[PDB]
Write a protein that holds these residues in place. Structure first.
Motif, short mmCIF file in Angstrom:
data_model
loop_
_atom_site.label_atom_id
_atom_site.label_comp_id
_atom_site.label_asym_id
_atom_site.label_seq_id
_atom_site.Cartn_x
_atom_site.Cartn_y
_atom_site.Cartn_z
N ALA B 10 37.49 25.03 53.61
CA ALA B 10 37.04 25.91 54.46
C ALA B 10 38.26 26.61 55.20
CB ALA B 10 36.11 24.91 55.80
N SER B 11 39.39 26.81 54.69
CA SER B 11 40.39 27.69 55.37
C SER B 11 40.33 28.86 54.58
CB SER B 11 41.82 26.86 54.77
OG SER B 11 42.91 27.47 55.55
N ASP B 12 41.26 29.97 55.31
CA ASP B 12 41.30 31.23 54.76
C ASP B 12 42.49 31.30 53.79
OD1 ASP B 12 43.17 30.69 56.80
OD2 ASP B 12 43.95 32.72 56.59
N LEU B 13 43.49 30.16 53.72
CA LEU B 13 44.44 30.25 52.68
C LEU B 13 43.74 29.68 51.31
CD1 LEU B 13 47.48 28.56 54.65
CD2 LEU B 13 46.92 30.81 54.14
N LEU B 14 44.46 30.04 50.24
CA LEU B 14 44.08 29.59 49.05
C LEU B 14 44.21 28.05 48.74
CD1 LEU B 14 44.71 32.80 48.42
CD2 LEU B 14 45.44 32.05 46.20
N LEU B 15 43.29 27.57 47.99
CA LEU B 15 43.25 25.96 47.81
C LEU B 15 44.85 25.56 47.45
CD1 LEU B 15 41.69 23.18 47.47
CD2 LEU B 15 41.51 24.09 45.11
N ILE B 44 46.82 23.88 40.37
CA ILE B 44 45.78 24.74 40.90
C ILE B 44 46.23 26.21 40.92
CG2 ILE B 44 44.37 25.27 43.08
CD1 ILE B 44 43.49 22.72 41.57
N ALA B 45 47.35 26.53 41.17
CA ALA B 45 47.73 27.97 41.11
C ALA B 45 47.82 28.40 39.63
CB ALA B 45 49.21 28.03 41.60
N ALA B 46 47.99 27.65 38.85
CA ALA B 46 47.66 28.20 37.41
C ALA B 46 46.26 28.12 37.11
CB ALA B 46 48.44 26.67 36.31
N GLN B 47 45.36 27.47 37.63
CA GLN B 47 43.72 27.74 37.48
C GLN B 47 43.45 28.82 38.14
OE1 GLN B 47 41.83 24.17 38.44
NE2 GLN B 47 43.01 22.77 37.14
N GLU B 48 44.10 29.22 39.22
CA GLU B 48 43.73 30.43 40.08
C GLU B 48 44.11 31.75 39.34
OE1 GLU B 48 46.05 29.52 43.61
OE2 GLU B 48 44.11 28.20 44.58
N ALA B 49 45.46 31.66 38.45
CA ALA B 49 45.75 32.69 37.69
C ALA B 49 44.80 33.09 36.83
CB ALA B 49 47.17 32.44 37.33
N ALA B 50 44.27 32.04 36.09
CA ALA B 50 43.49 31.96 34.94
C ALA B 50 42.08 32.70 35.39
CB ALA B 50 43.38 30.81 33.97
N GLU B 54 40.31 36.47 34.42
CA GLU B 54 39.05 36.72 33.69
C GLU B 54 37.92 37.74 34.56
OE1 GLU B 54 37.14 32.96 33.44
OE2 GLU B 54 38.92 31.95 32.06
N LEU B 55 38.37 37.95 35.89
CA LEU B 55 37.70 38.62 36.60
C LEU B 55 38.19 40.06 36.98
CD1 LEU B 55 36.03 35.91 37.06
CD2 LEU B 55 35.54 37.12 39.39
N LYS B 56 39.53 40.12 36.79
CA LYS B 56 40.14 41.38 37.03
C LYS B 56 39.71 42.57 36.15
CE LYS B 56 44.34 42.05 35.39
NZ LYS B 56 45.87 41.76 35.11
N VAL B 65 40.68 36.26 44.86
CA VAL B 65 40.57 35.07 44.24
C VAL B 65 39.95 34.02 45.51
CG1 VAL B 65 41.41 33.29 42.72
CG2 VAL B 65 42.27 35.48 42.58
N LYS B 66 40.54 34.27 46.42
CA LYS B 66 39.90 33.05 47.68
C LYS B 66 38.39 33.24 47.94
CE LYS B 66 39.14 32.87 52.20
NZ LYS B 66 37.99 33.30 53.00
N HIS B 67 37.90 34.41 47.99
CA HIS B 67 36.43 34.56 48.00
C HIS B 67 35.80 33.96 47.00
CE1 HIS B 67 32.89 37.10 46.97
NE2 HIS B 67 32.55 36.68 48.28
N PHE B 68 36.15 34.40 45.48
CA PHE B 68 35.40 33.63 44.51
C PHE B 68 35.79 32.11 44.39
CE2 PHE B 68 35.91 33.49 39.57
CZ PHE B 68 34.36 32.96 39.41
N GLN B 69 37.17 31.70 44.89
CA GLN B 69 37.16 30.30 44.74
C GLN B 69 36.42 29.49 45.70
OE1 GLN B 69 40.98 28.66 46.37
NE2 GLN B 69 41.32 27.57 44.17
#
Lengths: 257, 154, 61, 52
Positions: B10-15, B44-50, B54-56, B65-69
């Motif tokens: 529930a944070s604004d930061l990335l996971l 988690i950062a590696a998963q975030e990059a993948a 895929e959506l770029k 990514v934070k919105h989609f995550q």
């Protein structure tokens, strides 16, 4: 190399056949936590003589030994399971399709048509074996509905009507495998799973907050010692605890006056 | 509690970022749990990059990514976004086929884009391996269950 | 000793076991085969820019 | 096909909920109306308020 490649493919199939014969879960044997014994005798640090900085090192040691044992247990299972699969693969025949390659003859010359038909097989492999029948609204149907809506004078919102039709159709999209509808197929989307995780995290997170609230309401002075520094104070005997915060806690406990 | 005043999702930061600050607050750099938490954040950062790569192709470089995550896109939503850029993708594929060095390359790019244009050809792991996707979900809930057991016992 | 009641296996260790290797993309297999097949077309097609037909069969005059 | 008939029912209802009013065959712009069901519902709640 082709023989080893075929032997590898045969082993992959053997692993699948034995796993499906056991009908065991996919991640059960891959998750190392399934191998950890949570009923371990849990040695009591109050018995082993440890100083201020020794307790966190001791705990990290116990955890490392427990983690290593679970890793070794998974490897022990995988060693036995691999032995079982290698034997089953040895006594098995491999019958796998050949790589789709353009047809070429020593005297001939390949044509663009053969190259395209081979490329078509590659695109056929990209098609998933099972896929969602997401309905795409055809232009002929889209405009036919819009024409009827304008006929009854609802042309002001005829476009919006087509959006509700598409959404309502997609909400009930069916799943198809091999082009035929799979009956009785249930699935949980990533959005639903993430929503469950979000609520599940909030439940435990607020439970954590409620836990600490009880402590700080009765004993607010605990906030003077940071959680990450708490372990560096422990010792095997109560008299062995580091005095860095002992006197301070006793004074703050008396209150603001 | 500091950073722990809000839930892990529930944070604004990335996971991967929230995990890092939580690990630093819960444990000291010398602890074993600290190293494992930092390694976890890197995964988690590696998963975030993948996830981003895929959506770029639809939303550009600024995918957010934070919105989609935090809230993954529903399949119904993914269908409408596929149709949103379907015209621009078909035209882009046409200029890509015109820029092909040979007729065979033009056929390949058109055939490749034809498969990717069909929204039913979009691979969904929840459909191909349902028992796997549910296990990936209960994998997170089991980790959450471990923390709940600690609170329940306390 | 509440820390000893938690699972010793870390979440990082779980992810490195489940996701031991980055999976290859399904389309990369096509792109790699297509890029290689492009050289095959360049080799044997009387209509390409570069063709070996004049290299193997020099001339008939 | 298992629910194709039900889909046609939702389409008809959604279209009727936004039905427009026409006079002399032409659509009358800016026309507002209160149906008998809405008026009766208001009366029912209005009676319950005073009754309680």
């Amino acid at each position: 190399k082709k023989q080893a490649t075929e032997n590898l493919m045969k082993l992959l199939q053997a692993y699948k056949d034995i796993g499906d014969a056991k009908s065991e879960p996919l991640l059960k044997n891959h998750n190392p936590r399934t191998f950890e014994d949570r009923d371990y005798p849990v040695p009591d640090f109050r018995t082993q003589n440890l100083k201020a900085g020794d307790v966190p090192k001791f705990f990290d040691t116990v955890i490392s030994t427990r983690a290593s044992a679970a890793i070794a247990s998974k490897d022990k299972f995988w060693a036995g399971r691999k032995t079982e699969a290698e034997a089953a693969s040895a006594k098995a025949s491999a019958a796998f399709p050949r790589v789709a390659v353009p047809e070429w003859k020593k005297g001939k010359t390949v044509s663009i048509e053969n190259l395209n038909t081979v490329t078509d097989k590659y695109a056929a492999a990209l098609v998933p074996k099972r896929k969602l029948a997401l309905p795409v609204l055809p232009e002929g149907v889209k405009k036919a509905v819009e024409d009827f809506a304008a006929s009854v004078g609802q042309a002001k919102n005829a476009s919006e009507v087509s959006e509700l039709l598409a959404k309502s159709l997609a909400e009930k999209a069916v799943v198809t495998e091999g082009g035929k509808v799979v009956e009785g197929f249930s699935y949980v989307s990533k959005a639903v799973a993430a929503k469950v995780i979000a609520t599940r995290r909030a439940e435990v997170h607020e439970r954590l907050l409620k836990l600490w609230a009880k402590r700080l309401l009765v004993s607010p002075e605990l906030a003077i010692v940071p959680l990450n520094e708490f372990d560096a104070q422990l010792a095997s005997k109560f008299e062995g605890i580091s005095p860095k915060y002992q006197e301070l806690l006793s004074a703050v406990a008396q209150g603001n006056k | 509690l500091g950073p722990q005043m809000e839930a892990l999702g529930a944070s604004d930061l990335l996971l991967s970022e929230q995990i890092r600050v939580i690990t630093e607050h819960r444990y000291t750099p010398d602890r074993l749990q600290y190293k494992e938490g930092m390694k976890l954040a890197d995964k988690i950062a590696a998963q975030e990059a993948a996830l981003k790569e895929e959506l770029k192709v639809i939303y550009g470089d600024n995918v957010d990514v934070k919105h989609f995550q935090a809230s993954p896109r529903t399949p119904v939503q993914q269908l409408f976004d596929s149709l949103k850029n379907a015209a621009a993708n078909k035209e882009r594929a046409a200029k890509e086929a015109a820029a092909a060095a040979s007729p065979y390359l033009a056929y390949a790019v058109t055939k490749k884009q034809e498969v990717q244009a069909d929204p039913s050809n979009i691979p969904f792991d929840e459909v191909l391996y349902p028992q796997l996707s549910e296990e990936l979900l209960e994998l997170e809930l089991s980790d959450i269950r471990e923390d709940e057991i600690a609170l329940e016992k306390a | 000793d509440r820390v000893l009641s938690l699972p010793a296996v870390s979440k990082n260790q779980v992810l490195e076991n489940v996701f031991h290797t980055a999976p290859k993309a399904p389309v990369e297999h096509l792109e790699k085969m297509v890029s290689a097949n492009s050289k095959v077309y360049d080799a044997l097609n009387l209509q390409s820019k570069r063709v070996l037909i004049w290299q193997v069969k020099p001339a008939l005059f």
